[model samples]
Each structure stands twice: as C-alpha cells, then as structure tokens.
Target: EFWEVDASTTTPSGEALALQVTHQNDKPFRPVNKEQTQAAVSLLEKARYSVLEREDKPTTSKPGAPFITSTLQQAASTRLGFGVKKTMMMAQRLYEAGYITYMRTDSTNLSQDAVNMVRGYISDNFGKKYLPESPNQYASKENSQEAHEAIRPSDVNVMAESLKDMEADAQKLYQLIWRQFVACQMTPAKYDSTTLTVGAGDFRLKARGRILRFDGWTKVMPALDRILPAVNKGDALTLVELTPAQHFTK
Candidate 1:
C-alpha cells in the first residue's frame, strides 16, 4: 500500500488533483495514534508540497524464466487465486491430455525441440524485434536434478482458446501458463521512468511515474502503474485535503 499518504494537492497554476505518493523517504512511517495523525495533518495544512526534484530514467524489464512447479503454483495462486491442490489437479489433467509437459518438475531447462518451437513462434507471430538472436536460456537452482522438462504447452500453436471444452478454471490456468511460457522467450519491456521528490515543510515526500516505451514481455503480463501529472521542478503545491487512515502493516 506504499504507506498510502494522500497528498491531495493543487499545482501553482491552479490545477487541482491528487498525487500518488511513491513512498516516504525522509523517514520510515511509524504507526501513529489518532492525536498524532491529527497533529501531522495540522502541520501539513500550513506547509507547501513543492516538487524538489525530477528524474527520467530509461529502464528495461527482463522477462522471467519459464515456470517450474513452485513458480507455477505461486503464479496460479496470485494471478488466478487458485489453491495449490487445485492448481496441481488442473495441471494433472493438462498433462494427461497432452496439452502440456510434466508439471511437477524442478528443472527450468526445456528440451532442444521445445526451444526451437517457441522461438519460431515468437519470430513469426511477434516479428523479429520481439525475438532475440539466440534463445534465452535459464539456469536451474543449484540443487536441481529433475529429468522432467519445464512446464509449457506441448504445442506452441495450441493456445488457451483452443481448450474451450475444459472447465473455466482449467482454461484460466492454461492461459496463465501459456502467457508466462511465451513471455519468457520474448524481449524485455521498456519504460521511461520518472520520479519526483517533493518537500512539505521539513517532511520529504516522493512520487514516481513510468511510461512504457515498449510493451515487450509485459504485453503478455499485467503492468499497470500511475503516471504523474506534468509539473516542473520547484513548482509550488497547495494543499487540498488529506485523509488519514489506520492500516496494519502486511
């Protein structure tokens, strides 16, 4: 929740908007009681939140390695909200149907044939820009000794839509795995990242923004974030309203 400090503000040019704080940089946010929150609010009411700094950075987001057993369950749980047992059961059915390779493997290595298939698909479908000159290989964990291949579609052409006859959960899980597998073979996502440092009295506030320069691998994955308003460095900000909420840290 990024400490969730609501810096409701208006720019010096009379633009009223709410700014999403990236974080509190001056100090870590300690839990505050009601009176303390009120006192902080009262102090903030008189202070000016000015943009102290701005920086634009060209960045790249590398694709993740293909999913193994543990990674598959983690992605399923977070992305599909499926339980571990349920994920395994669906994966079991997928393997039995010959839609995907072995799902209970610890190895990240794909067979030579599997690599050849995905690379060709990426080149033909997504164009040469999304395809690397050589296949991206991944190193397995130090102790990994599994003989089974990484979990991936047996046929790169068989997408989740082709498995409509399967249950809804099964289809959803297949899409997740398919996307991950393909994204692993694609190019890195590109972004022009910008960050702002604002000063409110003696308190320092920080905010960040990122504009995707290229979809790259995130085209297959979710990459959503805030885009800050256009404001130059040293621009003065007027306080609008601030909401103080009590939240237990996760």
Candidate 2:
C-alpha cells in the first residue's frame, strides 16, 4: 500500500492550484496498491502543464518588537532548545553580572536610554538606512511590571560573544537576545514577490517566488531566502516530466 499528500496555493492572478498526490484513496484515505499506482503514473505521463497567468506584488516584513520576558523565552526555546527554567535562570545570572537588564518582567517597554544607544549603534555600524528617525515603542500589559524594562543587554555597546563569563549555551541565548533587541529598533525588511499561474487544460498550476529588496532587521535574524527565476506573465513553462505516486494517510 502507498500514501499521498496534497498541497494547495494561489497565484498572483488569484487562480487556485491544487497539487494532488496521485494514487490517493477516497475517504478514510488508504494507499492504493501497485496496480493502481502504476495506472496513476501512466495517466500523469500524458498530462500537459503550461503557464497561464503571472502577477507581481511588493511586500514588506516588519521587524519584531524588542523581546519581553515571554518572547525572549520563546525565542530561546525555539532557537537554542533551551527550556523555560534554564533560560530564566541563566538570564537571572546575566542580570546579576550586569550583562543584561532585569529578565523577569512582562513589559515590552524599553528605556529611552536604550533606544538612543541602539539607534546610535545602528547608525554607526549598519548605516543610516537601518536606523529609524524615531524610536520604536511597545506597550506592556495592564498588570505588567511597568517599573522594570524589557529584557535586553545592560549595555548596547557590548557584543554577545564578548561576555567571557557566560557559558556556551548562555552565550548563544544572549546573542539571540542581543540581535533581536537591536533589530527591533531597526528598519523593516522589504521584498518583491512574484507569482505565476500555469494553465494545463482545465488544471491551473501556480508558482510563487520572493526577492529581498533590503535585509533590514533580517540582517541579524535571517528569513525566507528563496529566489525564483525571472518569468513574466504569459510566459510559457516547459513541463519536462510528471511522476505520479500513491500514498496512505496512516
């Protein structure tokens, strides 16, 4: 028995395309036998596909705000595989050692002093294009510790790797925090995404692509880096081959 997977997406021209796994069974979804799989494959061998429509759109991705306690923990867990308890404990140590500000807080607000420091750093290191004219402000929860600032390095001038006292794992988390804190105040990333729709008989096939116009905050935190070939609307695409297979849901 075999299984299949189906994916769907839209074109720049708004046409919908469904990539169906051949050999997929009906409800309860079980894989087809070898005979059925071969039949589906034979059908796909004669199937035709071509470009039907194409469109382009400009897109912008804004940088995330400075990390608060929860966001910082989330990032550490996802990026560094550090648990909540471990993250907070190491963060507390960093705080006591003057490497970072208070780590236990719900407020996303940053002190004006931090804003100025990071702005200057961005201006000096990444050029003026990366620096925003005004500081980015984030509001805290109603019951948050308004008296404490968001989790960030005590001194913006210090690089994460320069903290010799921190353990390797702690250093990694610290670096993530450092980059995020600075990037939060930086300019937004820009992108130009182009999508194409292919028409093959009654079926429409769509292809999506993106290009980075400016790295912005993503300079520190990388994002989707896929680049597509140059293809305009109404351009024809050669379908070299189509291989179909069957799959089971279980």
Candidate 3:
C-alpha cells in the first residue's frame, strides 16, 4: 500500500493520474476522496480520555436509527481504518462464509422471521432484560432505493473459532468488524459520565471520568471503548497536580 502511494505521485502525469485512478477504484460505500492536505498539528503534552459512561447521567443517541452503509463504513474506519474496499470485501467474505449476512445493501429491513430469531437469540443468551419492550423496525431516509438488507451476521451459528488457523490479519479485522456491527443493534451501552470544569487561582481546567453499567453491546467492542474509572456528577476528585504548556507551528 505504501509503495503504491509513493510511486503514484512523482511523475509528470502522476498526480493527475493517481487522483483519477483513486476515483475509479473507490469503494461504493466509502466517502469520497478529497484532496490530500495537511492540517495544523498540535501535540497534547498530556491529556485524559473523558469517561462518558460513569457519571450520574449518561449520553446516548436517539434510538431506532437503523444502521446505514455509510455510517457502518465510517465506524469501521474510525475503529479499524480499513480502506473502504477492504472493509466491504471482508464483510462480503464473512457473508459468503455464512458467518454474517449480506453486506452490500443499504436497507435495514428485517424479515419477520429474522426478527423473531434474533430476539430469541438475544433473550436466550443475554437475558430477558436485554430484550426491548417492543420490536424495532427502522425506516430508511427519503428516496433511499435500498438494495439489500441491513448488514448482519449471515449466521449466528459461526463464532470466533480457531484463530490460530486463520490468517492473522483476517482473523483480527473480521472479528473486530463482526463484533461492532452486532453490538450496534443490541441494547444501548449504559454509562455514567462526570465532566469537571475546574477553577484554579490562575487556571481553569476540565477533566472527566466514567463508569459502565450494563455492558450491553460494548462487551464485544470493549477495547474499542474504554473501561473507565467509576465516577459520578458532582463527585469531588483530587487535583493531583498541574503541568505546563507550550506552542509550536510549522
């Protein structure tokens, strides 16, 4: 991949040709390729991951938005940085292998039978509390000529097995994407978040911590999301110390 990138941009027609070829090779579900440009770089001398899961109140998205192709692709990119084509291809293979459902479509339609099966699976494996009080059917956006059903495991029967027998990269990536998609459709991950806006004599600062309640889908993507410190809103925290800051430009 690195070699392809380096060789494609040095000849007289290299830049133009590379840009055009990038479009031709583009993946259907991936976002467009904009011009490559650098951004202002800044270094966080030190910082903290805000635990949005452990505070008195938790954050969540409005429910029942069926997973879309682009959003799914974006999540894979954020989590795994798989190029669009690679991500789609891995999904296709998983579907073909009968580990996941068809992955090429944009629709979120669930057959009545599929709903019953997944509902039963969730309840049986996770417990009745994990089951939503009502069934969920997501409506796609306006004019979406959805071609295939929402991405799902082709068969829930296939579990992560024999990682040693699988190619190292394939095992790692497929398992990563497979888990994320499944978890997204499951019960919402419950978390408590505490955001601290501090006022010091000369400095105002902010810090945060979180705690997980019901792991829900996160049980699959635990590493992707942190297990944060248990904390709550208005929880008094110790300010261990302070640090200095500097600036640079290029």
Candidate 4:
C-alpha cells in the first residue's frame, strides 16, 4: 500500500513539527497514517528538502445559484448534518409559518419583487460593488414547470442572526437558505493560490496553499483559512528530522 502523512506534533524541545506527501510510486494509489510517517522518513537520506520551482496564480469562484428544492435539502443535509426528511419537514413548517416561500418547486425561478428586495439588501449590506449590473438568471430543467419561486425567506429584511432563538435545526437551515439567497445576488469570491515544487533526489514534491483576496459571497459562508509558509523559487526547506514508519496493504 502507498502512504502519506497529515499530522502535526511537537518535538521534545518544544518545536512544532509535521510530515506531508513527498513522493508516490507507479501503483497509482497512496494511503496515509501517522505511524507510516516514521517508516517513510527512515527511507530518506536527505537532510533537507530543496525547492525546484515556485508558481503563484489568481483564482475566482462564482457564488452558487440560489437554492431550488433539491439543492436546499442537499446543502442542509451536508452542511448542517440534518437528514433529508428532517430538512424538508422543517422547511415545510417554515413555509407554513410564513417565514419562507414555497419550498417544493423544481424551478430556479424568483419573482421580480423578490429579486428587487434582494438586490436592495445586497447594496445596503454589502455595497454596490457586490451587486452585478444585471441579475443572474438560470433556466429551469427541461419539461419542468416553474410554478413556485425558489426557496427563499418571505422577508429579505429578516437576518439570520435575528433567528437565533428558534429551534437549532430551524435556525441553522434558515441561515443556510438565507446566505445562499443573499449570496446569489452578490459578487464572486477571489483567491490568491500558490504552489511550490521541491526536489529530493529522484523525487519531486508539491505543496499548495490559498489565501482569500475578496470574500464577497464567501463572507456569509466562511471557510477554514490555510496560510502557507512564505517561500520563493530555489528556496531550501529545512528538515527537522526523518522518522521511520510502517504500513500494511489492505
């Protein structure tokens, strides 16, 4: 079995330490574990990893479209860890309570009034820069009749933070839907992505990292930040230690 490591530890001298993917064989597969790290390190004779190339690039991420029925349920199931039936059940209650519009539609349709409300909200909260010159439009699936608006809050003025007192699942689902609705009307997120290549004997290793440039819609749906060590082309990587680890094929 092929292996790699994604663990962090402290040295006896109180220093942060870790080992990552360095190389792979022709088997076209790699497994990973902390114990295998020590074994992998035992095989390396090099004292340090040397940089062979460096690359930096900009990446853009368009905001997701506002949720249709199925998309809303999927997002809630994955993000909030709610079951599909529970998600729809809660959404149904919200709709009946006049908290949201119809939630069983197969269309991505939004009324002109709803669009205007969201656009105004985006301009007031996130500024005009986040609002596009023309609203984004999505076509419904073939043979599907668009009879109801895409799932959205009944009132655009209602903020997620204001619903904190509701039941936990209700609050979470509301926030998820609210963010998606608002973000659909907002700008795309941007990032500065970097990749570094290192050479060790006959092997080449790569490390990638990204930093948020403009949060845009992602501001509402934040992601864990991964800050990379500042490195340039031809820079040398210091090796703290080489540990030996073992593994078995499953």
Candidate 5:
C-alpha cells in the first residue's frame, strides 16, 4: 500500500502502508451478510492466522511459506517497523552477498536447480523427515510474474557467521529471511487456534488463542512465533479465573 498526502505524490516502501491479511480457516463459504464477513475477518485478525486459499497453500514449501512480496513487507513493517524500501534494500544486500538470491520478486516458483541444491542441503543438515513428505518444490501463485528469479539462497552453505561482522540491522535482516527460507523447505509451523464466542446475555463476547505445536522454523527467531492454549468447539469452557479491564473512548 502507498502512503498518500492531501495533493501530492504517494510514498513507496519505506513510507508505504503495509497491510497483512492472515487467514485462520480453510473452510469455504460465502458470507451471507456483513456481520458474517466481519466475524470471519475478526476471527482471523484476533487469532493472528490466515485462511490460506487452497491454491495459496504451500505445496513444496513448508507451512506458511517464506515471505512473499506483500506478506514480506507487511511483516517487516509490523514487526521490525521497517518500511518497504529498507526491507527491500536489506534483502538485496543479503542476496548480493551470496546469502540469498534475487530480492525483488512476486513469484513463488522455485527453479528445479535451486530446489535440488536446497533439498540436499536440508536433508543433510536437518534430516530426511524434515524434508517434505515428497520433493520440496513450490509453484508460484496464479498471475504471479516472477520478474526475476525466485527469492532463494545464493549459496546453501553460508552460515550465520557470514553476518557476524556486519552491522546489527543488516545482519538481523539477513538472518531473518535466510532462516525463514531454509525452514520453509522443512516442516510446517503447527499451532492450535481457539475461538470463544461467549454468550453474554444477548451480546457475543469473543476471545481467541494460538497454541504452538512445535517450534519448527520458529527456532531461528522466536519473536515472530505465537502459541495459544487449546480449547475445542462445543466444549464447556469456564472462566474460573480472569482479570478484566476496560477502556472507553468518548
């Protein structure tokens, strides 16, 4: 998203608006009303999950595949407070330094050559099971114009040490995307999500949680990971303990 002023040109990445739409469900249905759509969107936002379109689901890549063009920018902005330009610049440097491949890409497709290399690397380093149940490969989304090669590792062997002597920001950015790309070739980031639509008289009071099932790719950086406690639908839930507060705006 671009940042705009009253009557001037819009801003680009560093100043652009970053938007993230994470899905929390795979069930398919058309919302009959505004309330239904709102409920669905709110559930996804509150639970901080995405309802990845079946086509959007990762095929060869692990769950919640490494950052795509927009998702990457949205996440960098949301978490690191980085603008689009800065994120791209840092990613470019990482790519140039033989840490990652081309940075500016909208395509999710990976070359068979890169896949073969990374597959061997992951199998050797992580394990065979960590590799996909089948060959680890991913196809770009429909309408995805690769523009350049897929965002991938420039060299599979560059360890964290490559960034040790670099500045903090660049180093962190490099490591962040690097580890994510690697892990995406590994396992899914599984979690337990809960939705509580409490019937308070006539109004519905809602709450949600995300419980991480396994660390998976999160071991590289725990900051982005979120795990919630488990609760089931139609299961009796008691708020036996709670500390509540309220803020009203006038």
Candidate 6:
C-alpha cells in the first residue's frame, strides 16, 4: 500500500505538497500490510512533521532491462494505459508482423551478439560516454528461465516513428519495446540524491530529492523525478495533511 503524507513543507523552493517516503536503496518498497500502515498513521497523527535530517549523495540509476512479460505489461499499463490483455494482443501482432520477438516470455536475456551491435550503434549516433564497459543484462534475475529473449524489436534500426503500415496500437507498443531495448544497452543514469527525513512525534517520513546529473540511458527512457527545494536539518514544516493511499504492490 502507498501512504501519501501531505506535509505542508516550507522549503527554500516555493509551494507546499505531499512528500512520498521511499527506502534508501531505491528498490521497490516492500509490501506493507494493514497493521503497519495503521501504526504509522497513529504515530503521525500526534506528531509535528518537520525536517529532521537531510543527506545528499551521488547515486547511480542504471537503465532498466529490456522487458520480460511482466515488465512489459507494467510499462504499457503505466506509460500507454493499455490493459494486460490489450497489451498482449498488440505485442502478438508486432511479433507476427516481424517487428518484435516472441511476446510471451519471462526471460530478460538479450542475445549475446546484440550487445556489441547496440554498444557500437549508440556510440556512433550519440556520444561515446553512453557506451557501457560491459553489457546490460541486469534483468537476468534469478527467476528468469531464459525461455526467450526479452520482448524486443527484431530490427533495432527500424524505429516506430517510421513504421506506417502497422496498426496504431501495434506501432505504439513497438515503440515502447524499442526504446527499452536501446536504453537497456546504454550506460547508467546518474543523480545527486537527497534523502530528507521529516519527524512527526515518534514517527518519521522520508522523501527523495533527485537531481539528474547525467541522463545516460534516460535520454531514451525520457524523464526523471521531482526536485526538492534546498532545506536543512531541523527546519520547520507546516503539516497540511496526511493522505493514506492504497498503492498496489509491484
């Protein structure tokens, strides 16, 4: 579940808004059961929310792997608003049309040769800095069976913007896959991350302030997150409200 704590924070930047707390490692948050959520709410209710700590460090955000079945569905849902079934259907069309590999797969393995192809291709068009010393196969999770390559375009050169004959939906899905495949092979994204901790009685809420230092793979994935106004420890924050939201577990 997701809890949106809307602290009317006063920082050097400007306006006030809700700050989301995230784990320091930037990993997906662990699923929170009802009891944990309520306990947090109980502590927050009686406490004053203010900046307790602020730490800044340089962080590297590596490119996500080319999509496997679940990852592809997640991206399409968030980025394109396509339901799982509709996404599968379009991916099927793309595969048969020769634009993508098999759509139904759990593998994150990109072919061995493709890495060399992409690494060189990216260096030529973009800058040499985008090239990675090693290939990007971080998606080869322990669970991946290597059943099929991650859903990817058959031809990296033929981009979706130029594909005219395919159905609109299929073309869009191809673009999504295409970008991920290309970006997955590029260098990691960089950021200066600030972990801001707000204290409320015995409870604490955290927010990450990310500033993109180098848009390595994100050049293709397209964007980053919010920037926090400069603030220091022991700073005062106005408690506007706390909003508890049921965020689904990924």
Q: Where does model 1 exceed 4 Å of error? A: 1-5, 8-53, 140-147, 197-205, 223-250
Local distance difference test, per candidate?
Answer: 0.78, 0.69, 0.46, 0.69, 0.49, 0.74
Write model 4 residue lDDT over 1-250, tens digit each, in one string: 4455333333234444343545545232244665554554544445345666667788877887778888998899788888889999889877877788888887777778888999998888786668889887766542234456788888989976677556777877888888888888778887768776665554455667764678787877654326455555666565554434445676
> How do these models rank on lDDT, best leading?
1, 6, 2, 4, 5, 3
Question: Per-residue lDDT tens digits of candidate 2, residues 1-250?
Answer: 4644333433344444444432223223233576655555454445455555556688888888778889988988988889999999888878888898888787777877788888888888897788877887678432233466878887888987898988887788788889889888988888778665655443444456765678888987765335555555665444444444554556
Task: Please provide TM-scores, in order, for all candidate models, with all chains considered together.
Answer: 0.68, 0.69, 0.56, 0.69, 0.53, 0.62
Better of 3 and 6 by TM-score: 6
Please provide the root mean square deviation of candidate 3 (C-alpha atoms, Å).
Answer: 16.7
Model 5 C-alpha lDDT versus the unseen true structure: 0.49
Determine the C-alpha RMSD for candidate 6 after optimal superposition of all C-alphas. Answer: 9.3
Write down the RMSD of all candidates, one decimal each.
6.3, 6.7, 16.7, 6.2, 14.4, 9.3
Q: Stretches of candidate 5 above 4 Å error?
A: 1-62, 67-69, 127-129, 140-147, 194-208, 220-226, 229-242, 246-250
**Model 5, residue 48: C-alpha shift (Å):** 32
* Number of clashing residue pairs, candidate 1: 0
Model 2: which residue pairs collide?
2-247, 2-248, 3-246, 3-247, 3-248, 4-247, 52-198, 52-199
Better of 1 and 4 by TM-score: 4
Candidate 3 Cα misplacement greater than 4 A, ranges: 1-58, 61-68, 140-147, 162-166, 197-213, 222-228, 232-241, 247-250
lDDT of 5 by residue, 125-236 (tens): 7745566665545564432243445565667677656777656666766656666667667766555553433321212334444545555555543535223343334333
Error of 3 at 105 (Å): 0.5
Ranking by TM-score: 4, 2, 1, 6, 3, 5
lDDT of 1 by residue, 71-188 (tens): 9999999988999999999999988888888888887787778788988888888867788777778885332334567799989899898997788888888888888888888999
Instruction: State model 4's lDDT.
Output: 0.69
TM-score, prediction 4? 0.69
Local accuracy of candidate 6 as per-residue lDDT tens digits, 1-250:
5444334555545556356543323343332666666666566666666787878798888888889899999999999999999999999888887888898887787776666667777888788889887776665343234446888878788889777988898889999999999999999888778878776665566777775678899898885257666667877776656555666657
Residue-level lDDT for 152 in candidate 6: 84
